[PDB]
Subunit: 468 residues, 4 copies
């Protein structure tokens, strides 16, 4: 029941000023477990406070209100503060006064520096992944001000260019409208998105740009074009003045590291100039396969993905590079080569030779569904596997790469806009002797984009740290 | 233009939020800027929403923030105050004091009834129209608390009905998620939607329900079944104890008033028990035609409505009322009959015998387009007609019904969720001689449902009163 | 290869046509080449159809044309003669005379009953399955004249029913036009379909029809309503005078035999009054699984069926039996429950407890794909499994149920109209160790309907007899 | 009724040998009004004989059988002989013997030459129009042997090229399977389609091909690429050795003639080296507008086309040259610039300045619908306009460019594969004072393709002549 709804609103209204003071004065983003309370409607704060059951026992707004009331005068510097962890492991201390507990558990923060130098991001390409990257980058510059989108690079076409590019960022048939205002300065070739000025750079050669011409230096280029997937090709960006590092939103060929965030971002070194974020399916299934292989062992795995179509395919039957992709995407079920076996082996080198996979592309514009047919080296029960994945999903350090649900009503549309790389549908799970079958949802556009943003911030050094 | 000043703009908005929130709680006042609310919206919409005030007068946030701090002290009643109207006719006036002006432009309210009695709404049916009526009734209850959704009536199917119907309100392939929480209480057969308890009532006969059992009386029933379109049928509802009035979401047959809100809602009298809201197409074009007819003249007019499919139709060819309407809705363009021309002429009898039209149904799930080919009694040029409709849509008494837009690249999905009954695509207007072509978009589901909600509020006597 | 000889090939075929046509008229003989008819087909199909005889033995047209001229003189009866079987085991024999061979391979027929008594078929319902049953019954009446469609039964809607239902049989968004003419006789409530008069009978109660009124007796009813899936319900039909047997186009509940033709149709006895044809998915995969299970062994098996939507579902989210099944069928990928695994195990009880599966519904209107993940009791290689299924599909007793194909670029629309219950995509087969992945296409509407037509012909005693 | 069906079949079976003798011996294609009886099932011959009511009073097969029985020994040379016109205006002579009448009315033909030298056709491009052109060309080489498809030109890609190109001709998601067999000779880069060997030529420069290298000379290049629409560009083909003439399947810019067959093909001269077939909509509406403007006079016309999407558009929102075309075609109604006003003025120079037009692109893969809003210079009645268009459609020399129907059941799917440029839906027609509104269907892929084939045969000199 919700007979208490209006009080819940009323406490959250008390919370907003406090939340926003810590933001503007102390650069402190307040969260409740995974979920932000910053730049957010009162009703969202309610919804997110309900959510805390799904990790803890029972979370009332007052405990948040009281930690916030005692955080306003604690002279804090920048940091992400989880209001919920502070509630739980205060109650499990256990002794008031609250203040005392906070000053202790938020020690490194108190009095720390409230500014960090941001890092310039350039999007090379501005397509489906490119633009969702730009949305996220603009949201997070407003939360954290760590990575600044400064520019996009597109080829010169036909001089209404700029208006269409801004419109493609303002609007999306699938992802709906941009959270903010998008204005265009035609004279200086800039798209303004909220606070952020995005220079549009016209070029046919990734190697002959002087980014310093636009006040860009030391930039991470996120190439979302996919025209170059080998080191020799991606190396073109490093010839452009202003470029420190390159992230490919696609499987990199040869020696290029393929990085699945949460799983092998610790193998990114200071010296790695060129890195790749793998594919959407790779990011969807690799957390899961790694976690299952370490616990139970995977003799063999097949992946079938029932996948949304992408923009390389054709509205109507016509020629195409790949397998059967050139048949009309919106009228057909299409059997397609996935590279996901090979990709999963790159990042988990221990499953080399043990995996096969295949795609079926169907008439939807976003969101996909991996089916993992897994032969284990141990006998397993269904509820034990569900509970161990729910645990990883909700409390492990792959918390943000993996979600777990037991919703009997959700379908592909409901996953549009999810921030996880992979969402295990728990009701579906099958286990029988050594056989496991897992079903994984992913928003292949946005879910993947979020992984790429995380790679970009590790590389830039501006991942926020969460206390405690 | 630019957004060099965006972080400045956020700052102010945020000093507004606690003050907008006082008024709403303490004084039951909703605050707007030329018809855009600032209650239960982000800081970003407050920025957007003061920005679009250049369309109207030709507005700094401080003018609002200066206004607001006068209204926390003023012993105010229940009102929809506009900050925009209040600033314009302060400048273009003899000016200071501020306090003095806001206590004379706002005499009617200062110390008044802060609470009207709400009126109980029953939703008979709970499909595509009914569930959006629910979403609006719920969020307008938070804003104004005039009309309260009390109950839906459906037929008993299984024993898992209640939870399936809660799901249907919580998620939607087109309209996305409910803004709030939906909880189900099985013991009492209640869907909670934010603070709103919605009784589920199960009945095969609209005539044999004592609504007073469930605490409901003098209710308006919004029959969104489509089952009964004549007086006899809809009179069934009046036989049920607790029912005062009936609103049909559809063209009423025979002698039933068909109401297009903004145009002829004043034809509703206190003894009118049963009212009709006409079709989506009628609501979308009647305003535009009347405005065009009053200003230039209409000699002749053709309507082609290019229209989304509706749920009565068929995924794959099968039986239906009409031969063409039952063929695979998602695989065909379907030329079909429209009642619009005859229905437009009911409401505008001055156009009786001057109008024709057809409908073509296409594989989209929501949003339609009316193409209006008008021979006029007068010569027009494209830029002049545009500016006329732009003025009509900003200043006229049909603001809420008519919007006009200049935006490029816009397509049908961008109009999901729009509040206006019809939106004139400025870029598409064609005008040569006495010949005019207008393109009018409409969210046949949500746009139309907002018009239904205005009739309901009108019948019930709770149209918010907007001052001054 | 080439077609340097194509105009030569047409020439011969055309000297066949008048002779194939004699046999059919005079002697009630249908002529085929390894299971492909040459009656009421183009000259081009006769070329195609002698060409695909290299798949089987490893065939000149003259061998056929030489055969034919012997059969115009031979006082022949009613038979489905194969020209292919007759040529192969003439060469690989002691050969001339030709006349002598064809009067000893074809002793059973030479001078026999040229006319069997047909059996009256009633179609109860007339939707997606029923109308394709009609198309098959009509064109098989021209070929064999064993089962005759006599009547459909529908509920009275309007007074333009008859013509709407004639239209539904004449046109189809997926299956294209009826091959023939459909005429309506309103006075007698008859749809003419080529030479076939189909009575339309209107009834709310399957139990209260004297079919003998309309000249129908000892009929098989093919209940394609879906309404009644148990013995009690389907027994209603037997209470109607004129009814002998009932065939349900669906999995029958309880104790009703579920029949997969090619596999267990011999379980039908003369005292079986009510029979079930199982689901599309069951018909598509049961044959393949049994063949794979007999040859290698099945230790474990998972089925994912990627499946077209069906007409019970919803264009746009609304109520349904299942929560997920009622969401917008054309906008979503929908993970849902399948009965297939349990139904496969009914028919193959040797696989009881070794099978699992799920279904995903996608926005296509017809044609589905079963993905079979099989752990086998034996090691297999891709090329060997392929050649096995290829042999099974050409030579085995499940030829009509199983096809195998090597063709590139094939996608779901190319399988509309296919006669086989399931078609193995050769290119997609994956095999490594004991692990096998098979992809089986099926026209869930037309393929399945052909299996229904085989049960019907079997129950009725009119399976064409194919010699020698 | 069809109680006489089997006799109808039986007479047509007598007809087939005769039809085919005249074909193979005399190169004589027999037709009944518009419809061929050659390479066609018996049931088609029936259907086409029914059709003759729709032009005449009552047509029985026997009159066809008897004209054919007396045509077999009349020593005829090549010609198209309409069996129906010969039936009508024999009965309206009137005197037997039949023979005498034929030898007189088929005078020019008797004893004439039975061979004509064919013309080599090259398809530059092999996309949606290209391949339908290839289907038609292969059908008509088998009927008339006037234009021979010899080659396609595609750019060099990635070496599975040839198999995909053959597969794209074999199969089509919308147009279904090819009528014949398609084999590939990989060694000589040939696609065999039935009798016809198609050389695949790989080139990046239309100007540097020696077509004589492949035994091609004096060829009409049908450029269906649309990369070059100006004379300077199309002139590139004339530099290639082997090229006589060029036909652009698109509006040609500048001085290039835009040819709508039936309407201005008489303006093609012996000296015109480069000609264009206009657009699909232009071909759909120009017959109609010309015919209406000559009778009644067109003050002003607007065209709205509700148009299928084409392959230049995007599955999902992305950048694009044109207006709003880059939004996702399968999810949206999209307002688009048509050039059809300008195009219709080119071919009808008399409507210059009097026409506007617009497209709405909707989620269908083929078939479109023009709505013509016409202000006339005369008052008109509805039935008189319907009857005058039905007359033009069925008996004028634009018979094949225009059809007329009064079918209450047909929708866009039913027009796939129509051979007319434009099909007027007569039930829809509106007329009121000086205002006419006409609705025109067209299969924008195939309908247009057929017009282009006709242009190709006029230019080649191999249009067949029909007697009488
Ligand atoms: N664009 C639009 O959709 C649009 C716009 C304007 C007006 N309209 C009109 O609004 C009406 C509702 O349309 P809709 O699209 O919302 O239809 P819908 O989605 O089919 O919803 C209709 C609702 O009414 C219920 N219902 C139907 N027949 C009933 C009966 N005999 N007894 C009780 N309940 C019954 C349904 O029951 P279940 O939930 O059990 O199926 C469902 O809840 C129609 O008259 C339509 O013409 C529609
Ligand atoms: N892929 C497939 O479609 C497929 C394959 C295998 C088996 N099945 C099964 O075959 C059955 C038929 O499915 P379908 O897709 O053909 O359904 P459909 O297209 O809805 O056709 C069902 C037909 O039965 C009629 N009907 C329904 N309820 C009735 C009732 N109470 N009394 C009398 N007639 C009634 C309908 O009447 P109206 O014409 O008046 O609407 C319609 O003629 C279902 O059980 C389904 O599970 C379907
Ligand atoms: N409704 C219709 O589709 C329709 C109707 C009437 C007229 N038209 C016009 O007909 C033309 C063809 O349209 P379509 O729908 O057939 O387009 P399409 O399906 O894209 O076919 C284009 C063909 O031309 C080739 N091509 C494209 N650019 C080329 C280049 N620079 N050099 C060489 N070859 C090139 C393509 O090569 P690949 O195969 O390698 O991709 C393909 O074979 C267009 O101008 C269009 O406006 C279309």
């Amino acid at each position: 029941n919700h007979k208490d709804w209006n009080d819940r609103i009323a406490v959250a209204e008390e919370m907003v000023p406090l939340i926003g003071r810590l933001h503007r004065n102390n650069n402190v983003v307040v969260s409740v477990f995974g979920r932000l309370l910053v730049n957010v409607s009162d009703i969202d704060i309610i919804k997110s406070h309900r959510y805390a059951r799904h990790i803890i026992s029972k979370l009332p707004l007052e405990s948040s209100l009281d930690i916030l009331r005692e955080l306003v005068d604690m002279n804090l510097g920048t940091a992400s503060i989880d209001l919920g962890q502070l509630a739980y492991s205060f109650e499990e201390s256990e002794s008031t006064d609250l203040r005392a507990f906070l000053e202790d558990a938020l020690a490194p923060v108190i009095g720390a520096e409230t500014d960090i130098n941001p890092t310039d991001i350039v999007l090379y390409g501005f397509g489906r992944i490119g633009r969702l990257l730009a949305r996220i980058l603009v949201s997070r510059e407003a939360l954290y001000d760590g990575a600044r989108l400064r520019a996009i690079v597109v080829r010169k076409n036909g001089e209404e260019d700029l208006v269409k590019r801004a419109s493609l960022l303002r609007r999306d048939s699938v992802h709906g409208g941009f959270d903010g205002t998008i204005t265009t300065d035609y004279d200086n070739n800039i798209i303004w998105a909220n606070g952020t000025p995005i220079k549009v750079i016209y070029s046919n050669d990734p190697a002959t740009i002087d980014y310093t011409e636009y006040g860009i230096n030391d930039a991470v280029v996120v190439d979302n074009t996919g025209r170059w997937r080998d080191r020799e090709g991606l190396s073109q960006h490093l010839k452009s003045k202003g470029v420190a590092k390159v992230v490919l939103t696609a499987p990199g060929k040869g020696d290029l590291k393929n990085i699945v965030y949460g799983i092998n971002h610790t193998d990114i070194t200071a010296d790695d100039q060129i890195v790749s974020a793998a594919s959407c399916t790779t990011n969807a299934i690799t957390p899961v396969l790694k976690v299952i292989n370490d616990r139970y062992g995977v003799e063999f795995g097949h992946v079938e993905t029932v996948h949304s179509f992408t923009n390389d395919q054709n509205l109507i039957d016509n020629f195409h590079k790949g397998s059967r992709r050139g048949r009309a995407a919106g009228l057909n079920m299409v059997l397609t080569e996935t590279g996901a076996a090979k990709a999963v082996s790159k990042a988990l080198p221990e499953l080399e030779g043990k995996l096969t996979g295949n795609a079926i592309r169907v008439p939807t514009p976003d969101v996909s569904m991996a089916v993992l047919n897994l032969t284990l080296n141990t006998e397993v029960d269904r509820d034990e596997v569900n509970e161990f994945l729910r645990r990883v999903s909700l409390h492990s350090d792959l918390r943000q790469q993996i979600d777990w649900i037991r919703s009997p009503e959700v379908v592909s549309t409901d996953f549009v806009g999810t921030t996880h790389a992979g969402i295990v549908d728990g009701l579906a799970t099958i286990a029988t002797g050594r056989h496991l079958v897992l079903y994984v949802w992913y928003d292949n556009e946005f879910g993947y984009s979020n992984q790429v943003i995380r790679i970009v911030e590790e590389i830039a050094g501006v991942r926020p740290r969460v206390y405690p």
